[PDB]
């Protein structure tokens, strides 16, 4: 068995976010040009994927966290992480 | 066990496509700014990844669907999904 | 069981790189507009993800290769692949 990761990046610095599903929990490591740090994202899941887009200089991120057949969408728009009503 | 997903997005609306491998079948959920809907993509696979690029406002998508060691490339270019001749190795 | 892939792309040609974890080894298939070929990337891993960004016309790629709880970051910036000091948590 191994952990399962997902990655996204933006700009040219770059900024990078790496998500890791490990024993039913997803955590986040972050690079903004000056070291890797532990990010605010921490939610349940056995599987993770991610996508992101910029609106001007502001990053928007969607993290799809799945356990069993249930997928939860987590949303970042600059002010914290919230789960949406997204339902597979 | 759990399902396995892959996601891609484009533009600033944005549009998002989320692919889910579940019991050997990959399906697709779609967002173009006005609700989530079930997409046209439905193909066999135990594993899925995706990438996409824009040419102007036209989206192009490649979905890599795997079973065993066999990886099949599915292509969207505005007018349906088609399997390419892509092979692993 | 099945292989596990990750994909990235850039520009409008486009270029595409597909990474596959297969029996503890990750390999790479490449498209630059003129056929699929086996890429330089070949490293151990049971799981792979990837991201890339352009700086002008130069592609930069990070591949995250995991075995157990150990994740290795492999870096391409035009001159070959090297591992960084990236350590999970
Ligand atoms: C996208 C977001 O990134 C981190 O959020 C932290 C936020 O970090 C960033 C900032 O340092 C960077 O240079 C550019 O933008 C980002 O938003 O910074 C604030 C403090 O200003 C907090 O530390 C945020 O946690 C992650 O922690 C988030 O989970 C998310 O990935
Ligand atoms: C990329 C494509 O998206 C869906 O295709 C549907 C298509 O949707 C899109 C459109 O509504 C959007 O605003 C921009 O581009 C797309 O083409 O719209 C037609 C009706 O106009 C059908 O609904 C298509 O199914 C998915 O269903 C496809 O699988 C694919 O992801
Ligand atoms: C990004 C890189 O791509 C391959 O590297 C090969 C390199 O390929 C590219 C070139 O042919 C293309 O038109 C645009 O840029 C790329 O860098 O070409 C050199 C010799 O010219 C070698 O063939 C490199 O191997 C992969 O092999 C790398 O692993 C990586 O994905
Ligand atoms: C881009 C969209 O952002 C919000 O409206 C979310 O609630 C949606 O589920 C989608 O991710
Ligand atoms: C970008 C390229 O598009 C088509 O030519 C496909 O047949 C290739 O396999 C590749 O995806
Ligand atoms: C963008 C950064 O590039 C190098 O500095 C690496 O050592 C980092 O881990 C990161 O990927």
Short mmCIF file of C-alpha atoms and ligand atoms in Angstrom, two decimals:
data_model
loop_
_atom_site.label_atom_id
_atom_site.label_comp_id
_atom_site.label_asym_id
_atom_site.label_seq_id
_atom_site.Cartn_x
_atom_site.Cartn_y
_atom_site.Cartn_z
CA UNK A 1 0.00 0.00 0.00
CA UNK A 2 1.15 3.53 -0.52
CA UNK A 3 -0.15 7.03 0.01
CA UNK A 4 -1.88 8.71 -2.95
CA UNK A 5 -1.07 12.24 -4.07
CA UNK A 6 -2.44 15.00 -6.27
CA UNK A 7 -0.69 18.23 -7.31
CA UNK A 8 -1.49 21.66 -8.71
CA UNK A 9 0.55 24.79 -9.45
CA UNK A 10 0.06 28.36 -10.64
CA UNK A 11 2.06 31.33 -11.90
CA UNK A 12 5.76 31.21 -12.70
CA UNK A 13 7.32 31.34 -9.20
CA UNK A 14 5.56 28.87 -8.97
CA UNK A 15 3.16 28.19 -6.18
CA UNK A 16 2.59 24.43 -5.76
CA UNK A 17 0.10 22.49 -3.63
CA UNK A 18 0.54 18.76 -3.07
CA UNK A 19 -2.31 16.78 -1.45
CA UNK A 20 -1.69 13.35 0.13
CA UNK A 21 -4.33 10.77 1.14
CA UNK A 22 -2.77 8.65 3.92
CA UNK A 23 -4.86 6.24 6.01
CA UNK A 24 -8.16 7.98 5.27
CA UNK A 25 -6.89 11.54 5.84
CA UNK A 26 -5.84 14.18 3.32
CA UNK A 27 -3.21 16.77 4.16
CA UNK A 28 -1.54 19.50 2.13
CA UNK A 29 2.00 20.70 1.52
CA UNK A 30 2.66 24.12 0.02
CA UNK A 31 5.39 25.96 -1.86
CA UNK A 32 5.14 29.71 -2.56
CA UNK A 33 8.86 30.20 -3.51
CA UNK A 34 10.33 30.14 -0.01
CA UNK A 35 10.03 26.66 1.55
CA UNK A 36 7.52 23.82 1.91
CA UNK A 37 4.99 24.22 4.67
CA UNK A 38 1.96 22.42 6.00
CA UNK A 39 -1.21 23.96 4.58
CA UNK A 40 -4.63 24.71 6.03
CA UNK A 41 -6.29 21.81 4.17
CA UNK A 42 -6.95 18.75 6.35
CA UNK A 43 -10.00 16.61 5.59
CA UNK A 44 -11.02 12.96 5.34
CA UNK A 45 -10.49 10.94 2.24
CA UNK A 46 -8.98 7.79 0.87
CA UNK A 47 -8.53 9.44 -2.53
CA UNK A 48 -7.78 12.93 -3.68
CA UNK A 49 -7.69 15.01 -6.86
CA UNK A 50 -7.33 18.74 -7.37
CA UNK A 51 -7.66 21.50 -9.93
CA UNK A 52 -7.10 25.23 -9.67
CA UNK A 53 -7.43 28.39 -11.75
CA UNK A 54 -6.31 31.99 -11.37
CA UNK A 55 -8.66 34.99 -11.56
CA UNK A 56 -6.11 37.79 -11.94
CA UNK A 57 -3.61 37.05 -9.15
CA UNK A 58 -6.10 35.18 -6.93
CA UNK A 59 -5.93 31.37 -6.87
CA UNK A 60 -9.10 29.28 -6.72
CA UNK A 61 -8.78 25.63 -5.78
CA UNK A 62 -11.09 22.62 -5.79
CA UNK A 63 -10.09 19.44 -3.96
CA UNK A 64 -12.19 16.30 -4.58
CA UNK A 65 -11.95 14.03 -1.52
CA UNK A 66 -13.48 10.54 -1.77
CA UNK A 67 -14.21 7.81 0.73
CA UNK A 68 -16.09 4.77 -0.54
CA UNK A 69 -18.34 6.04 -3.33
CA UNK A 70 -18.78 9.48 -1.76
CA UNK A 71 -16.90 12.46 -3.16
CA UNK A 72 -16.79 15.76 -1.29
CA UNK A 73 -15.77 18.99 -3.06
CA UNK A 74 -13.64 21.37 -0.93
CA UNK A 75 -13.35 24.97 -2.10
CA UNK A 76 -10.68 27.60 -1.62
CA UNK A 77 -11.34 31.15 -2.88
CA UNK A 78 -8.89 33.06 -0.68
CA UNK A 79 -10.73 32.98 2.67
CA UNK A 80 -10.68 29.38 3.90
CA UNK A 81 -11.82 25.93 2.91
CA UNK A 82 -15.50 25.08 2.67
CA UNK A 83 -17.30 22.02 1.39
CA UNK A 84 -19.89 22.52 -1.36
CA UNK A 85 -23.13 20.65 -2.11
CA UNK A 86 -21.24 18.69 -4.82
CA UNK A 87 -22.52 15.10 -4.91
CA UNK A 88 -21.28 12.42 -7.36
CA UNK B 1 -11.68 0.66 -1.31
CA UNK B 2 -12.77 3.94 -2.71
CA UNK B 3 -13.47 5.47 -6.04
CA UNK B 4 -10.60 7.30 -7.74
CA UNK B 5 -11.00 10.76 -9.33
CA UNK B 6 -9.19 13.17 -11.62
CA UNK B 7 -10.10 16.77 -12.35
CA UNK B 8 -9.37 19.49 -14.87
CA UNK B 9 -10.55 23.11 -15.25
CA UNK B 10 -10.27 25.93 -17.70
CA UNK B 11 -10.91 29.61 -18.07
CA UNK B 12 -12.02 31.84 -15.23
CA UNK B 13 -15.72 30.95 -14.94
CA UNK B 14 -14.40 28.25 -14.61
CA UNK B 15 -15.44 25.08 -16.34
CA UNK B 16 -14.49 21.97 -14.37
CA UNK B 17 -14.62 18.28 -15.32
CA UNK B 18 -14.37 15.61 -12.68
CA UNK B 19 -13.78 11.98 -13.73
CA UNK B 20 -14.55 9.12 -11.36
CA UNK B 21 -13.36 5.52 -11.74
CA UNK B 22 -15.82 3.32 -9.85
CA UNK B 23 -16.11 -0.48 -10.25
CA UNK B 24 -14.32 -0.47 -13.58
CA UNK B 25 -16.37 2.39 -15.08
CA UNK B 26 -15.34 6.03 -15.51
CA UNK B 27 -18.01 8.67 -15.52
CA UNK B 28 -17.86 12.45 -15.68
CA UNK B 29 -19.41 15.35 -13.78
CA UNK B 30 -19.33 18.85 -15.34
CA UNK B 31 -19.55 22.50 -14.22
CA UNK B 32 -19.76 25.41 -16.69
CA UNK B 33 -20.89 28.01 -14.16
CA UNK B 34 -24.57 27.08 -13.78
CA UNK B 35 -24.79 23.72 -12.06
CA UNK B 36 -23.24 20.29 -12.05
CA UNK B 37 -24.40 17.84 -14.72
CA UNK B 38 -23.52 14.36 -15.91
CA UNK B 39 -21.21 14.50 -18.87
CA UNK B 40 -21.06 12.53 -22.10
CA UNK B 41 -17.90 10.63 -21.05
CA UNK B 42 -18.65 7.06 -20.04
CA UNK B 43 -15.92 4.45 -20.63
CA UNK B 44 -14.40 1.45 -18.95
CA UNK B 45 -11.47 1.87 -16.58
CA UNK B 46 -10.12 1.12 -13.18
CA UNK B 47 -7.93 4.21 -13.19
CA UNK B 48 -8.27 7.65 -14.74
CA UNK B 49 -6.15 10.77 -15.29
CA UNK B 50 -6.88 13.85 -17.35
CA UNK B 51 -5.31 16.90 -18.89
CA UNK B 52 -6.75 19.73 -21.03
CA UNK B 53 -5.72 22.82 -22.95
CA UNK B 54 -7.41 25.77 -24.60
CA UNK B 55 -7.05 26.96 -28.20
CA UNK B 56 -8.89 30.27 -28.00
CA UNK B 57 -12.11 29.39 -26.21
CA UNK B 58 -12.12 25.82 -27.60
CA UNK B 59 -11.30 23.18 -24.96
CA UNK B 60 -9.35 20.03 -25.76
CA UNK B 61 -9.36 17.16 -23.31
CA UNK B 62 -7.36 13.96 -23.00
CA UNK B 63 -8.56 11.28 -20.58
CA UNK B 64 -6.27 8.29 -19.87
CA UNK B 65 -8.31 5.28 -18.85
CA UNK B 66 -6.46 2.21 -17.55
CA UNK B 67 -7.35 -1.41 -16.85
CA UNK B 68 -4.51 -3.81 -16.06
CA UNK B 69 -1.54 -2.45 -18.00
CA UNK B 70 -3.71 -1.18 -20.86
CA UNK B 71 -4.11 2.57 -21.11
CA UNK B 72 -6.61 4.03 -23.56
CA UNK B 73 -6.56 7.71 -24.59
CA UNK B 74 -9.91 9.39 -25.15
CA UNK B 75 -9.96 12.74 -26.95
CA UNK B 76 -12.47 15.57 -26.83
CA UNK B 77 -12.13 18.38 -29.36
CA UNK B 78 -15.65 19.87 -29.33
CA UNK B 79 -17.46 17.18 -31.25
CA UNK B 80 -17.54 14.03 -29.18
CA UNK B 81 -15.11 11.70 -27.51
CA UNK B 82 -12.97 9.49 -29.75
CA UNK B 83 -10.42 6.84 -28.84
CA UNK B 84 -6.95 7.46 -30.26
CA UNK B 85 -4.39 4.80 -31.20
CA UNK B 86 -2.45 5.64 -27.97
CA UNK B 87 -0.68 2.70 -26.34
CA UNK B 88 1.45 2.36 -23.22
CA UNK B 89 5.17 1.31 -23.66
CA UNK C 1 -5.22 -4.42 -10.08
CA UNK C 2 -4.21 -1.76 -12.55
CA UNK C 3 -1.53 0.73 -13.38
CA UNK C 4 -1.98 4.30 -12.11
CA UNK C 5 -1.41 7.33 -14.35
CA UNK C 6 -0.92 11.07 -14.06
CA UNK C 7 -0.86 13.60 -16.95
CA UNK C 8 0.22 17.14 -17.70
CA UNK C 9 0.21 19.31 -20.82
CA UNK C 10 1.36 22.69 -22.01
CA UNK C 11 1.02 25.14 -24.90
CA UNK C 12 -1.33 24.73 -27.85
CA UNK C 13 0.49 22.03 -29.89
CA UNK C 14 0.22 20.67 -27.18
CA UNK C 15 2.99 18.83 -25.43
CA UNK C 16 1.71 16.07 -23.16
CA UNK C 17 3.47 13.86 -20.59
CA UNK C 18 1.82 10.78 -19.21
CA UNK C 19 3.37 9.08 -16.16
CA UNK C 20 2.47 5.48 -15.29
CA UNK C 21 3.17 3.62 -12.03
CA UNK C 22 3.39 -0.07 -12.87
CA UNK C 23 4.71 -2.71 -10.43
CA UNK C 24 6.65 -0.13 -8.37
CA UNK C 25 8.23 1.69 -11.31
CA UNK C 26 7.17 4.99 -12.90
CA UNK C 27 7.79 5.58 -16.62
CA UNK C 28 6.89 8.41 -18.95
CA UNK C 29 5.27 8.69 -22.38
CA UNK C 30 5.63 11.96 -24.30
CA UNK C 31 3.86 13.86 -27.09
CA UNK C 32 5.32 17.03 -28.68
CA UNK C 33 3.15 17.07 -31.82
CA UNK C 34 4.84 14.28 -33.81
CA UNK C 35 4.22 10.90 -32.14
CA UNK C 36 4.40 9.29 -28.71
CA UNK C 37 7.83 8.37 -27.37
CA UNK C 38 9.37 7.01 -24.18
CA UNK C 39 10.64 9.85 -22.03
CA UNK C 40 13.75 10.25 -19.90
CA UNK C 41 11.81 9.88 -16.63
CA UNK C 42 12.24 6.48 -14.98
CA UNK C 43 12.06 6.25 -11.19
CA UNK C 44 10.60 4.04 -8.45
CA UNK C 45 7.11 4.58 -7.15
CA UNK C 46 3.77 2.91 -6.50
CA UNK C 47 1.92 6.20 -6.98
CA UNK C 48 2.58 9.26 -9.14
CA UNK C 49 1.17 12.78 -9.55
CA UNK C 50 2.52 15.63 -11.62
CA UNK C 51 2.22 19.35 -12.20
CA UNK C 52 3.96 21.68 -14.61
CA UNK C 53 4.28 25.39 -15.47
CA UNK C 54 5.79 27.42 -18.30
CA UNK C 55 8.36 30.18 -17.85
CA UNK C 56 8.34 31.74 -21.31
CA UNK C 57 8.72 28.75 -23.62
CA UNK C 58 10.53 26.58 -21.07
CA UNK C 59 8.57 23.84 -19.31
CA UNK C 60 9.15 23.06 -15.66
CA UNK C 61 7.82 19.79 -14.26
CA UNK C 62 7.46 18.30 -10.77
CA UNK C 63 6.68 14.63 -10.43
CA UNK C 64 5.70 13.27 -6.98
CA UNK C 65 6.60 9.58 -6.66
CA UNK C 66 5.38 7.68 -3.59
CA UNK C 67 6.17 4.32 -2.05
CA UNK C 68 4.63 3.62 1.38
CA UNK C 69 4.46 6.98 3.13
CA UNK C 70 7.61 8.35 1.42
CA UNK C 71 7.11 10.92 -1.34
CA UNK C 72 10.01 11.96 -3.59
CA UNK C 73 9.83 15.11 -5.72
CA UNK C 74 11.53 14.86 -9.11
CA UNK C 75 12.33 18.07 -10.92
CA UNK C 76 12.72 18.93 -14.59
CA UNK C 77 13.80 22.44 -15.63
CA UNK C 78 15.26 21.66 -19.04
CA UNK C 79 18.54 19.92 -18.12
CA UNK C 80 17.57 16.54 -16.71
CA UNK C 81 15.67 15.05 -13.81
CA UNK C 82 16.87 15.48 -10.22
CA UNK C 83 15.31 14.72 -6.87
CA UNK C 84 14.79 17.54 -4.39
CA UNK C 85 14.89 17.40 -0.57
CA UNK C 86 11.05 17.33 -0.57
CA UNK C 87 10.01 15.19 2.41
CA UNK C 88 6.39 14.33 3.18
CA UNK C 89 5.26 16.32 6.31
C1 LIG D 1 -4.00 28.67 -1.51
C2 LIG D 1 -3.85 28.44 0.01
O1 LIG D 1 -2.49 28.61 0.37
C3 LIG D 1 -2.23 28.52 1.78
O2 LIG D 1 -2.93 29.53 2.50
C4 LIG D 1 -2.18 30.38 3.35
C5 LIG D 1 -1.90 31.72 2.67
O3 LIG D 1 -0.90 31.45 1.72
C6 LIG D 1 -0.61 32.07 0.47
C7 LIG D 1 0.42 33.20 0.54
O4 LIG D 1 1.34 32.99 1.59
C8 LIG D 1 1.12 33.17 -0.81
O5 LIG D 1 2.29 33.92 -0.86
C9 LIG D 1 0.13 33.48 -1.93
O6 LIG D 1 -1.22 33.19 -1.56
C10 LIG D 1 -1.61 32.21 -0.67
O7 LIG D 1 -2.95 32.44 -0.32
O8 LIG D 1 -1.39 32.66 3.59
C11 LIG D 1 -2.21 32.88 4.71
C12 LIG D 1 -1.55 33.95 5.56
O9 LIG D 1 -1.54 35.09 4.74
C13 LIG D 1 -2.47 31.63 5.52
O10 LIG D 1 -1.24 31.23 6.03
C14 LIG D 1 -3.04 30.54 4.59
O11 LIG D 1 -3.19 29.30 5.25
C15 LIG D 1 -2.70 27.16 2.33
O12 LIG D 1 -2.55 27.10 3.75
C16 LIG D 1 -4.16 26.92 1.93
O13 LIG D 1 -4.60 25.66 2.39
C17 LIG D 1 -4.31 27.06 0.41
O14 LIG D 1 -3.57 26.04 -0.23
C1 LIG D 2 -16.07 19.51 -22.86
C2 LIG D 2 -17.35 18.66 -22.81
O1 LIG D 2 -18.33 19.25 -21.97
C3 LIG D 2 -19.56 18.55 -22.01
O2 LIG D 2 -20.08 18.59 -23.35
C4 LIG D 2 -21.40 19.15 -23.46
C5 LIG D 2 -21.36 20.56 -24.03
O3 LIG D 2 -20.89 21.36 -22.98
C6 LIG D 2 -20.08 22.52 -23.10
C7 LIG D 2 -20.82 23.87 -23.07
O4 LIG D 2 -22.11 23.79 -22.46
C8 LIG D 2 -19.88 24.81 -22.35
O5 LIG D 2 -20.50 25.99 -21.89
C9 LIG D 2 -18.59 24.98 -23.15
O6 LIG D 2 -18.18 23.82 -23.92
C10 LIG D 2 -18.77 22.56 -23.90
O7 LIG D 2 -18.80 22.06 -25.24
O8 LIG D 2 -22.63 21.07 -24.39
C11 LIG D 2 -23.41 20.23 -25.23
C12 LIG D 2 -24.74 20.95 -25.46
O9 LIG D 2 -24.36 22.21 -25.95
C13 LIG D 2 -23.61 18.87 -24.61
O10 LIG D 2 -24.27 19.14 -23.41
C14 LIG D 2 -22.25 18.21 -24.33
O11 LIG D 2 -22.43 16.97 -23.66
C15 LIG D 2 -19.45 17.10 -21.57
O12 LIG D 2 -20.72 16.45 -21.65
C16 LIG D 2 -18.38 16.43 -22.44
O13 LIG D 2 -18.21 15.10 -22.02
C17 LIG D 2 -17.08 17.24 -22.36
O14 LIG D 2 -16.54 17.25 -21.04
C1 LIG D 3 10.03 17.89 -20.86
C2 LIG D 3 10.93 16.68 -21.18
O1 LIG D 3 10.64 16.17 -22.45
C3 LIG D 3 11.46 15.11 -22.87
O2 LIG D 3 12.81 15.60 -22.95
C4 LIG D 3 13.48 15.45 -24.20
C5 LIG D 3 13.55 16.77 -24.99
O3 LIG D 3 12.20 16.97 -25.38
C6 LIG D 3 11.49 18.15 -25.77
C7 LIG D 3 11.62 18.61 -27.23
O4 LIG D 3 11.92 17.56 -28.14
C8 LIG D 3 10.28 19.29 -27.52
O5 LIG D 3 10.04 19.59 -28.87
C9 LIG D 3 10.04 20.50 -26.62
O6 LIG D 3 10.78 20.44 -25.40
C10 LIG D 3 11.13 19.26 -24.78
O7 LIG D 3 12.08 19.53 -23.76
O8 LIG D 3 14.43 16.62 -26.10
C11 LIG D 3 15.75 16.26 -25.74
C12 LIG D 3 16.70 16.34 -26.94
O9 LIG D 3 16.34 17.44 -27.74
C13 LIG D 3 15.71 14.86 -25.17
O10 LIG D 3 15.07 14.05 -26.14
C14 LIG D 3 14.85 14.90 -23.89
O11 LIG D 3 14.73 13.59 -23.36
C15 LIG D 3 11.41 13.92 -21.90
O12 LIG D 3 12.32 12.94 -22.36
C16 LIG D 3 11.74 14.43 -20.49
O13 LIG D 3 11.71 13.36 -19.57
C17 LIG D 3 10.77 15.54 -20.15
O14 LIG D 3 9.43 15.03 -20.09
C1 LIG D 4 -16.69 26.65 -9.44
C2 LIG D 4 -17.83 26.30 -8.50
O1 LIG D 4 -17.68 27.05 -7.30
C3 LIG D 4 -18.81 27.02 -6.45
O2 LIG D 4 -20.02 27.60 -7.02
C4 LIG D 4 -18.95 25.56 -6.00
O3 LIG D 4 -20.00 25.46 -5.05
C5 LIG D 4 -19.17 24.66 -7.20
O4 LIG D 4 -19.48 23.33 -6.77
C6 LIG D 4 -18.01 24.81 -8.22
O5 LIG D 4 -16.80 24.31 -7.69
C1 LIG D 5 -2.48 15.84 -28.79
C2 LIG D 5 -2.64 14.60 -29.66
O1 LIG D 5 -3.93 14.67 -30.27
C3 LIG D 5 -4.18 13.59 -31.19
O2 LIG D 5 -3.37 13.67 -32.38
C4 LIG D 5 -4.04 12.23 -30.48
O3 LIG D 5 -4.25 11.13 -31.38
C5 LIG D 5 -2.67 12.12 -29.79
O4 LIG D 5 -2.55 10.82 -29.19
C6 LIG D 5 -2.46 13.33 -28.85
O5 LIG D 5 -3.41 13.35 -27.79
C1 LIG D 6 9.51 24.98 -7.24
C2 LIG D 6 10.59 24.38 -6.35
O1 LIG D 6 11.73 24.07 -7.14
C3 LIG D 6 12.89 23.72 -6.40
O2 LIG D 6 13.43 24.81 -5.64
C4 LIG D 6 12.57 22.49 -5.53
O3 LIG D 6 13.69 22.18 -4.73
C5 LIG D 6 11.30 22.69 -4.69
O4 LIG D 6 11.05 21.56 -3.88
C6 LIG D 6 10.11 23.14 -5.57
O5 LIG D 6 9.62 22.14 -6.45
#
